[PDB]
């Protein structure tokens, strides 16, 4: 068992469903789908070294810009301490510290 041999296949025109979790994209083509999957398969070495943030990017520039959001404005800011937070729940629960 050393030799080998492979080959494609064909069948009626059916609806193909992306074998990816969450994804809701479909296509009635085997060629178009493969091209789409390319998006799911890749690599994201660049990681946001921010507190709380656990996202990642592929392009260096992409990240840089994203980071700006942290080094700028925040969708969550306290009143008393006037601090900034990434998550909402944290802010709500945080208040406790202020009050009794």
State in angstroms the smallest separation of the CB of 8 from Zn ion: 22
- Torsion of the alpha carbons at 45, 46, 51 and 53, rounded to the nearest 10: -80
Contacts (CB under 5 A) with Zn ion, residues 11-30: 18, 20, 23, 25
CA 34, CA 41: separation in Å to the nearest integer? 10
Q: How far is the CB of 48 from Zn ion (least distance, A)?
A: 3
Of 51-70, binders to Zn ion (CB under 5 A) are 53
Residue 26 · residue 15 · CB < 8 Å: yes
Q: Pick left, alpha or beta for residue 82 (phi over 0 → left; psi -120 to 50 → alpha; otherwise beta).
A: left
Q: How far is the CB of 26 from Zn ion (least distance, A)?
A: 9
Q: Which residues bind Zn ion (CB under 5 A)?
A: 18, 20, 23, 25, 48, 50, 53, 78, 80-81
């Amino acid at each position: 068992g050393s030799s080998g041999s492979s080959g494609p296949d064909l069948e009626k025109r059916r609806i193909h469903y992306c074998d990816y979790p969450g994804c809701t994209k479909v296509y009635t083509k085997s060629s178009h789908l493969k091209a789409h999957l390319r998006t799911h398969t890749g690599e994201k070495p660049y990681k946001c070294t921010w507190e709380g943030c656990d996202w990642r990017f592929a392009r260096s520039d992409e990240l840089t810009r994203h980071y700006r959001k942290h080094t700028g404005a925040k969708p969550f800011q306290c009143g008393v301490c006037n601090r900034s937070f990434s998550r909402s729940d944290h802010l709500a629960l945080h208040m406790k510290r202020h009050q009794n």
